[PDB]
């Protein structure tokens, strides 16, 4: 049966990903939180 | 369907008293002197 997560590079980079996150204040919040944690991957 | 209690070591070792293999049914080969399976070809020599 059709499961969830039918992957798609364009949609993955458009919904998540650096430029989408930087386009809202809350997205910039998540990048700030991830940098504060020392996370190696931000979006 | 499912065990009600452990199997103690005594019970286990009792159950596996007949879990063993027997020595092969082997005989000395008349031609070469090495052991072989009775009614089989001597693998060391190749006779009979």
């Amino acid at each position: 049966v059709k499961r969830t997560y039918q992957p798609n590079k364009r949609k993955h980079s458009k919904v998540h990903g650096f430029r989408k996150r930087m386009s809202t204040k809350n997205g910039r919040k998540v990048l700030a939180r991830r940098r504060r944690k020392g996370r190696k991957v931000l979006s | 369907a499912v065990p009600k209690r452990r199997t103690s070591k005594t019970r286990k070792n009792k159950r596996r008293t007949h879990f063993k293999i027997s020595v092969p049914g082997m005989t000395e080969c008349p031609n070469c002197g090495e052991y072989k399976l009775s009614h089989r070809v001597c693998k060391n020599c190749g006779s009979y």
Binding site: - | H39, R40, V41, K43
Partner: protein
């Protein structure tokens, strides 16, 4: 008669294959049960070859596979021809037997009794 872990059509095909292969090679290595069963098939083939007439040849063609043997000197002939032209001659005076089975030990991948079945 044995079933050899195989359906009726698959067992028939396998037995006639094994018979043809023993005829081609004069001696093969196989399992004990399959040799015990191919003994009868190949021996009835040699019986048909010993009669030599056309109806018997047409009857032995029912069982043998269309296999080709390269003799020496680039001589070429079928399994049927080998049956009726060289093996029937080898056993014209013998009134049965025609095969011998030599038990060998168990193979490695299973415990299967490997045997040599040859012609005699």
């Amino acid at each position: 008669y044995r079933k050899l872990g195989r359906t009726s059509d698959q067992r028939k095909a396998m037995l006639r294959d094994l018979a043809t292969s023993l005829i081609i090679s004069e001696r093969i290595e196989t399992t004990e049960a399959r040799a015990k069963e191919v003994r009868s098939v190949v021996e009835k083939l040699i019986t048909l070859g010993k009669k030599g007439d056309l109806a018997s040849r047409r009857n032995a063609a029912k069982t043998l596979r269309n296999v080709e043997i390269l003799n020496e000197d680039e001589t070429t002939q079928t399994a049927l021809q080998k049956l009726f032209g060289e093996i029937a001659e080898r056993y014209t005076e013998r009134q049965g037997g025609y095969t011998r089975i030599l038990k060998q030990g168990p193979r490695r991948g299973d415990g299967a009794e490997s045997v040599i079945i040859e012609l005699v």
